[PDB]
Design a protein around this ligand. Structure first.
Ligand SMILES: O=P(O)(O)O[C@H]1[C@H](OP(=O)(O)O)[C@@H](OP(=O)(O)O)[C@H](OP(=O)(O)O)[C@@H](OP(=O)(O)O)[C@H]1OP(=O)(O)O
Ligand SMILES: Nc1ncnc2c1ncn2[C@@H]1O[C@H](COP(=O)(O)OP(=O)(O)OP(=O)(O)O)[C@@H](O)[C@H]1O
Length: 1011
């Protein structure tokens, strides 16, 4: 079986069905350039059972700028490129069998040996050989999935060919959407209306199956094609033959395979299916395809690449391209600038672009070997011409090789910019997979190597986990339970010994802001984030905005990913981005009316939290508050309203003392959860109960629950009982052995267990969606008397010692199998599912949902890292606003979207006075500067009067407060008493609305200086 323990996220990303094909899979790859190296890293991280790399060339000092595994001695010994790194390749995954070859490739070379590979990847060989290879593989039975990837300086090319036909099992990879049926009409085609505010996002031609229909019992399980009518209506073919529609009904999306017809490589040369990544230039892919075809023709003609600055070579290439365009089907325009840049950067090689294209190539290889997603069809082109376009006309002397390990980079971008990279200061936040790939990018880029100014700072407080070995490739098995940052720094220094770097074990937060003060940010030049949560991102945004520093953001959600670029005075902010929050599940829905397995999953998560962390913590905190039980009793007798008294007293009263007591407590909890709750619900609302309009109360989406009889013979019952018993024993520190949860031992204790009889009673029920968690209703004195009797019996039994008040609060772990938390949550969720007869779910899905695990894969990480590095270079160049390109992509399609970053805004306030997010106003006064003096200072310095004052969150002035509007006569040093941490104070004030009736209009924050 798959080693899920390491693979983790990938399982959700792809599906174990696909994983069954990563086993038994055999992949060939040749060329072993930098691009080939990145592709190989991605593939080994993916988990291909067998990989055969191949190369014929040996090590050069030039290659040191493109390979991380390479050492100087490898070039010293003139070793073959593939061989010098094959050993390191095996380090990534023992489960992968990787092999190398050096058999020469030529026009007379036999190819039949390649039959043992499902997919073949080609880099760095001449085009005609590629043509022959494509012919052979696509002529094989079955045709062999062919992929050619190439990089030249600041350019790339990606192509795929899976034969004349390819069966894509899943086009999108999304979950099958579920729709609640509101109305059905007997028609041909029958019109079906969903619930209002429930957009269905269908397309005409899709297919769909149904279940639980009132009326058409026959349509349950039937499959129909659909034509969309409205966002909540559509057609499903003839339905007149059947009953009237009664109610209910569920729409389950049905996925179907699709066929993609890849054409031959050579024919695709004259008819390239170029995908578009920039709508503003839907012709650029065609032009670049022509340009590099002309380059290939030049290399064929001269057996060499053009010399940089050799205008003769550029003119020849331009003539060649001019010739080629006419041969094309469309005969598009010719870009002389593109030809010039190709000739200018032919000899170079760009590492980040290589990483990005390699990630995409690995994704296409996975699609080829799985069919899990619609692959590229057929061409793709990526470029970095923006970078060199900003440089105007630099001379070839900037790009001349100088012997160092960055000669190729110098050829790509020029020596001056290379030096700029060498002297940067980067404060990378978080060291997740994205962070690690980033550090690899700088290490290849020589960033910060200059002892003069280069100083790379990264902080991360977490430790290396086994699952993280799937993606954070810089780490090794013997590094688990060790700081991510230290391991990453050591690996980076191994990659490039010249690098200047520092690490930290800190977590970024306002508490640690003392370390990461404003001056530290001033030291920093570019800030990159690799976070996982949103609020931390917003906090970092606020800090960088206060520090006027550029920031880069990225995120990877499975096949999808996004990059955000923010530049001072040019772009908006991540805070300016205001994405809506999640879709709240009503408190009533979660507590009483589940309809989807996710509801029960969250419910079980919350119940676990309350049962094993929250309530135990309340218990422990209470006993810290109060020394002894006698004191508590005397207080309560004297009317002391001690918080949580009832719940805590009930807890200790039901506190077990032995393993059998743990088992019976678990049994009682099971009865309460899955029998008595449903019974009480039914008592409150019988099955026949109906709404005021007369329709059924127990209609969709509400599901009438059905109580469940216990039986240890049911695997679910036994598992739940075991998990609950173990958790409770851990709570009460009850010693135990693994023989205790043997089923026979359990039922032995269970045989004499007296099951309490259910008893309904009147209870307050919230049902409305917006009806939310009610506050504590005051409790009758009768229950206080009950609790008093309980603690009386406890003290009389002397079951009140300090140890009797000691208990170990649990912490929710999700990655370890032996804490049982995942098992318990799975048992509870499945039980609740059957409780309402809702569809069950597997353990792993429950773990993902409850743990809020975001699926991630190596390829998306590498690709976004490449793009982020590119944007970092663009930042370093100080390029104008137009160059930077915010990127969003969904490799599931696959699709790459390039767009200009959102421009900054001049927020006008009054009479044309406009301020951007980058504007922080300031005022200088003295110790006597009162609040009103500050009002006047604002009014004079920016022509606007304040109307309320907040220091951070401190409401310092508002007209609706009578007793504190007098603060106007008070200087801040005595009014707010600013902290000694700052020479200044940072504020935010809104002003009188121009619309009299509206609220105060916010303005830029102000840093006031006391002198
Ligand atoms: O406080 P919560 O953990 O959120 O859950 C409570 C709790 O059930 P547990 O005891 O199983 O945790 C209550 O029990 P007590 O804490 O009061 O002993 C129970 O109340 P009853 O004992 O009176 O049944 C109540 O159920 P209800 O609100 O229906 O009375 C139930 O609520 P949830 O489990 O739905 O949160
Ligand atoms: N406030 C913070 N300060 C520092 N590092 C942070 C902060 N918040 C998150 N991080 C880091 O962000 C990184 C995110 O990494 P990544 O997205 O690969 O997954 P993860 O958090 O390690 O866990 P999982 O793989 O289960 O998603 C973590 O290594 C974590 O240490």
């Amino acid at each position: 079986e798959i080693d899920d323990a390491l693979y983790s996220r990938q399982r959700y990303v792809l599906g174990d069905t696909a994983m069954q094909k990563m086993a038994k899979s055999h992949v060939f790859l040749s060329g072993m350039g930098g691009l080939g190296l990145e592709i190989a890293k991605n593939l080994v991280l993916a988990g291909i059972k067998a990989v055969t790399i191949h190369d014929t060339e040996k090590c050069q000092a030039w290659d040191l700028g493109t390979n991380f595994f390479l050492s100087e001695d490898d070039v010293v010994n003139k070793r073959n490129r593939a061989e010098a790194v094959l050993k390191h390749i095996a380090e990534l995954n023992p489960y992968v069998h990787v092999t190398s070859s050096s058999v020469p490739f030529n026009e007379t070379t036999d190819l039949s040996f390649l039959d043992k590979y499902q997919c073949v990847v080609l880099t760095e060989m001449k085009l005609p050989l590629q043509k022959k290879i494509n012919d052979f593989c696509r002529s094989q039975c079955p045709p062999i999935k062919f992929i050619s990837a190439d990089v030249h300086g600041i350019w790339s090319r990606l192509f795929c060919d899976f034969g004349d036909e390819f069966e894509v099992l899943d086009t999108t990879g999304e979950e099958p959407k579920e729709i609640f049926i509101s109305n059905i009409t007997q028609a041909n085609p029958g019109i079906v209306t969903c619930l209002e505010n429930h957009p269905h996002k269908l397309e005409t031609g899709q297919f769909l199956t149904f279940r639980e229909i009132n009326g058409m019992t026959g349509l349950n399980g039937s499959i129909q094609q659909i034509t969309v009518i409205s966002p909540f209506s559509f057609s499903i073919g003839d339905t007149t033959e059947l009953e009237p529609y009664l109610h209910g009904g569920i729409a389950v999306q049905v996925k179907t395979p699709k066929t993609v017809f890849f054409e031959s490589l050579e024919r695709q040369l004259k008819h390239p299916k170029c995908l578009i990544v920039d709508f503003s230039n839907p012709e650029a892919p065609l032009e670049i395809h022509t340009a590099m075809l002309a380059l290939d023709q030049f290399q064929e003609k001269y057996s060499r690449k053009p010399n940089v600055g050799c205008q003769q070579d550029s003119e020849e290439l331009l003539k060649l391209a001019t010739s080629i365009s006419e041969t094309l089907e469309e005969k598009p325009d010719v870009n002389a600038d593109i030809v010039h840049w190709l000739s200018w950067t032919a000899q170079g090689f760009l590492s980040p672009l290589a990483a990005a294209v390699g990630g995409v190539a690995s994704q296409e290889v996975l699609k080829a070997v799985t069919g899990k997603f619609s692959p590229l069809c057929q061409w793709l082109y990526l470029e970095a011409a923006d970078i060199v376009e900003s440089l105007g006309k630099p001379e070839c002397e900037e790009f001349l090789p100088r012997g160092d390990r960055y000669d190729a980079l110098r050829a790509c971008i020029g020596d001056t910019l290379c030096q700029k990279l060498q002297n940067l200061n980067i404060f990378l936040v978080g060291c997740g997979a994205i962070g690690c790939e980033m550090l690899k990018n700088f290490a290849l880029l020589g960033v910060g190597t200059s002892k003069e100014k280069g100083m790379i700072t990264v902080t991360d407080p977490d430790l290396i986990e086994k699952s993280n070995l799937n993606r954070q490739f810089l780490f090794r098995p013997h590094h688990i339970q060790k700081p991510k940052s230290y391991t990453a720094a050591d690996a980076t220094l191994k990659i490039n010994s010249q690098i200047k770097i520092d690490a930290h074990l800190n977590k970024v937060c306002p508490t640690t802001e003392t370390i990461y003060n404003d001056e530290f940010y001033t030291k920093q030049d570019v800030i990159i984030t690799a976070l996982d949560n949103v609020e931390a991102r917003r906090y970092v945004d606020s800090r960088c905005l206060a520090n006027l520093r550029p920031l880069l953001d990225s995120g990877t959600m499975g096949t999808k990913g996004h990059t955000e670029v923010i530049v001072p005075h040019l772009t908006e902010s991540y805070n300016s981005h205001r994405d809506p929050p999640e879709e709240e599940i009503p408190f009533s829905t979660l507590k009483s009316f589940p309809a989807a397995i996710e509801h029960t999953i969250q419910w079980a998560r919350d119940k676990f939290e309350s049962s094993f962390s929250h309530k135990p913590s309340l218990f422990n905190k209470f006993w810290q508050t109060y020394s002894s039980a006698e004191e508590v009793l005397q207080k309560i007798q004297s009317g002391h309203s001690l918080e949580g008294c009832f719940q805590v007293i009930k807890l200790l009263s039901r506190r077990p003392r032995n393993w059998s007591q743990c088992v019976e407590l678990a049994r009682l909890k099971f009865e309460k959860y899955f029998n008595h709750k449903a019974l009480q619900l039914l008592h409150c609302f019988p099955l026949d109960i109906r709404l005021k309009d007369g329709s059924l109360f127990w209609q969709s989406p509400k599901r009438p629950p059905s109580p469940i009889k216990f039986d240890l013979n049911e695997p679910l019952h036994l598992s739940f009982l075991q998990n609950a018993a173990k958790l409770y024993a851990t709570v009460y520190c009850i010693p135990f052995a693994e023989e205790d949860l043997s089923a026979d031992a359990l039922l032995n204790i269970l045989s004499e267990v007296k099951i309490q009889e259910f008893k309904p009673s009147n209870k307050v029920v919230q049902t409305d969606e917006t009806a939310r968690k009610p506050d504590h209703v005051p409790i009758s004195s009768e229950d206080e008397r009950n609790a008093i009797f309980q603690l009386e019996k406890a003290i009389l039994s002397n079951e009140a010692t300090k140890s009797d008040l000691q208990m170990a609060v649990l912490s929710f772990e999700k990655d370890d199998d032996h804490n049982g938390h995942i098992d318990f949550i799975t048992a509870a969720s499945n039980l609740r599912a059957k409780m309402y007869s809702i569809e069950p779910a597997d353990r792993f899905k429950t773990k993902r949902i409850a743990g809020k695990i975001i699926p991630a894969i190596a390829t998306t990480t590498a690709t976004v890292s490449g793009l982020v590095a590119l944007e970092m270079i663009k930042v370093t160049g100080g390029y104008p606003f137009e160059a930077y390109k915010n990127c969003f992509l969904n490799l599931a399609i696959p699709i790459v979207v390039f767009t200009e970053t959102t421009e900054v805004r001049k927020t006008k306030i009054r009479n044309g006075i406009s301020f951007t997010i980058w504007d922080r106003w300031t005022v200088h006064g003295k110790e006597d500067f009162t609040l009103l003096d500050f009002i006047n200072a604002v009014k004079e310095k920016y022509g606007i009067e304040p109307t309320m004052v907040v220091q951070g969150v401190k409401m310092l002035y508002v007209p609706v407060m009578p007793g504190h509007a007098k603060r106007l006569k008070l200087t801040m040093h005595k009014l707010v008493k600013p902290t000694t941490e700052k020479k200044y104070v940072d504020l935010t004030v809104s002003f009188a609305p121009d619309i009299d009736g509206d609220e105060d209009l916010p303005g830029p924050p102000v840093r006031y200086y006391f002198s």
